[PDB]
Nucleic acid binder design. Structure first.
Length: 245
RNA sequence: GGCACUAACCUAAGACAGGAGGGCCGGGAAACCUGCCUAAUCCAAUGACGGGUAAUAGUGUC
């Protein structure tokens, strides 16, 4: 359990460098949690006591380029919010449950639209934010272990700001053919390369501001087709068939 | 092109409800720091502080 690592004056250094210096001289590999500036300080968190003292050790073993020393200060602390937000096993358990109600057997279709507001989640004080990586991970895992044959996924209206955390879906739900991502915050068509592995037939993107980066439907259509060459329907419209040969 | 910074912009479900200033207990020779208190005054749910990058300039970096 957790430790806050304060680096005085840390503001003035390159995150990647500073962490490199530190990591180099550190007899343990560490992953900094919630690295953030705060006045002049840089600040981050680390998981355990072994890693924390190891970080303390680097104290006289590192110098900035102005030949001044860089101090690593350590203090036990509460787990960081991003860690406290992760779902507990019991909560995942109820999550599986709710997904099942939202699952149509005759169509192998999972409906996660506006998931955060599900009354059964609200009733059990389960906050499910699919933009959060731990959330997206637990959802996909549940899909990998209970319904890898998933055919149709609905993720509309979930304030998705990106798809980075979805990339492993290509492997988790390999036969996915239908995907609704409308009503989200996807900024650009490049979010699609993260999941371009999917052999989609149907896809919805409307409501995402990425759509407005096109001067016509034709370009918009071809842009999607680069990632999904067999795409048949888009935003509930039947597309012209793929150019022959 | 990547990555970082200043700007711009997005974010309270793209990390976050207080931030600056001031003060307190503790540690420390000091520097400085964990935690806490606080309308002198400034900023802040019309979102400060923190975070983020799909899009735009400026700078470094590989």
């Amino acid at each position: 359990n957790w430790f806050k690592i304060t680096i005085p004056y840390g503001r003035k250094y390159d995150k990647a460098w500073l962490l490199s210096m530190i990591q180099s001289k550190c007899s343990v590999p560490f992953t900094p949690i919630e690295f953030h500036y705060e006045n002049t300080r840089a600040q981050f968190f680390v998981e355990d006591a072994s890693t924390a003292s190891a970080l303390k050790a680097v104290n006289y073993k590192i110098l900035d380029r102005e030949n001044r020393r860089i101090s690593i200060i350590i203090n036990s602390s509460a787990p960081p919010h991003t860690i406290l937000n992760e779902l507990k096993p019991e909560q995942v358990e109820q999550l599986k449950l709710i997904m099942s109600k939202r699952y149509d057997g005759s169509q192998q279709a999972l409906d996660l639209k506006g998931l955060r507001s599900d009354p059964d989640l609200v009733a059990q004080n389960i906050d499910v934010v699919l933009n959060r990586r731990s959330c997206m991970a637990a959802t996909l895992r549940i899909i990998e272990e209970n319904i890898p044959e998933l055919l149709s996924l609905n993720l509309s209206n979930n304030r998705l700001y990106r798809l980075d955390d979805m990339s492993s879906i290509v492997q988790k739900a390999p036969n996915l053919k239908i995907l609704n991502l409308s009503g989200n915050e996807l900024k650009s068509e490049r979010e699609l390369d993260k999941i371009k592995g999917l052999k989609l037939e149907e896809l919805w993107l409307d409501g995402n501001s990425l759509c407005d980066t096109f001067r016509d439907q034709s370009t918009y259509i071809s842009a999607i087709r680069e990632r999904f060459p067999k795409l048949l329907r888009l935003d509930g419209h039947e597309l012209p068939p793929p150019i022959a040969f």
